[PDB]
């Protein structure tokens, strides 16, 4: 009843040939010259090596099979850049490549947000330092304590420990059992409440009515500047493009429109009422 993808694959690997030293040399010389069968046999025979390191690389990020596959990618590069001319054995060289490719994949696929290996490597040293500090300081490392030990900036240490924070699941509930999910607590913020949206509809509507209440030449340069009626939000000097074509007269008329409108808000009943807002 062998149904499990893992046990099936490990069955297939066991069913391979194990290679010797002189056999590795014969196959490796044929392999680099570009043999089909030599490449396949060297890879298939050394799969067991991938698994032994892949089994001791679990419970960190991906699953056993996931690590086994990426480790196998290391085996391929190892067979490609193996030197049979050097008297030294293959297993030693391959171990490097398999560990390299597994580690690199574990640094990328695990972190939900793609993080650079540069920041990750720095982080490693910060964490190792924390370990040594923890053994002697019965408490745990402060950011400042770590920064003093590496002779590096407090700000830089804090930035790094800020990228270490793991992501929480929103689909996962909090209220004891399954009473409410994090999704149902957390509201859509970029989206305004209907009360806020309706308030903007009233200001915009009021502006249209406020535009047909002042002077015809006082709401032709006050709105075409702010981009209220116009298409583009211009500045005091840029209102000259239309018909105004002035710098002094535009600035006097902008503020003249606002002063008469300030009295329109003092009389309707806003001014200091709508100052808090």
């Amino acid at each position: 009843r062998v149904l499990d993808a893992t046990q099936l694959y490990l069955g297939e690997i066991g069913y391979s040939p194990l290679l010797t030293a002189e056999e590795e040399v014969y196959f490796a010389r044929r392999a680099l010259r570009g043999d089909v069968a030599s490449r396949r046999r060297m890879i298939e025979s050394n799969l067991r090596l991938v698994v032994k390191i892949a089994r001791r690389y679990g419970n960190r990020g991906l699953a056993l099979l996931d690590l086994i596959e990426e480790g196998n990618l290391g085996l391929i590069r190892a067979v490609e850049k193996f030197d049979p001319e050097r008297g030294f054995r293959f297993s030693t060289y391959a171990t490097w490549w398999i560990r390299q490719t597994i580690e690199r994949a574990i640094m990328n696929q695990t972190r939900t947000i793609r993080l650079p290996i540069h920041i990750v490597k720095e982080l490693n040293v910060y964490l190792r330092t924390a370990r040594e500090l923890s053994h002697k300081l019965d408490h745990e490392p402060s950011a400042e304590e770590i920064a003093e030990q590496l002779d590096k900036p407090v700000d830089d240490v804090s930035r790094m420990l800020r990228l270490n924070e793991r992501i929480t699941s929103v689909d996962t509930p909090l209220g004891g059992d399954s009473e409410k999910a994090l999704l149902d607590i957390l509201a859509d913020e970029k989206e305004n409440g209907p009360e806020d949206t309706t308030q903007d509809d009233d200001m915009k509507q009021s502006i249209v009515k406020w535009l047909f209440e002042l002077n015809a030449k006082q709401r032709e340069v006050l709105a075409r500047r702010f981009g209220l009626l116009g298409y583009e939000a211009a500045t005091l000097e840029d209102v000259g493009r239309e018909i105004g074509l002035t710098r002094e007269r535009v600035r006097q008329i902008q503020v003249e429109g606002l002063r008469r409108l300030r009295e329109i808000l003092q009389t309707q009943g806003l001014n200091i009422e709508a100052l808090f807002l």
């Binding site: 209907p194 949206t197 309706t198 509809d201």
Partner: protein
């Protein structure tokens, strides 16, 4: 009162305008349901009048 996004704002404006008219729409939960069924690879279409 719930999902209909356009509907809730429009009816709020009507109630301040004193119109007391509904103008209903389509609940956003249903739009999601459709997207979640298409994400399964089932074609679920609205057939028009």
């Amino acid at each position: 009162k719930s999902d209909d996004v356009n509907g809730r704002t429009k009816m709020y404006k009507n109630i301040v305008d004193g119109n007391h008219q509904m103008e209903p729409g389509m609940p956003e939960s249903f739009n999601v349901l459709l997207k979640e069924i298409r994400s399964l690879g089932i074609n679920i279409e609205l057939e028009d009048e």
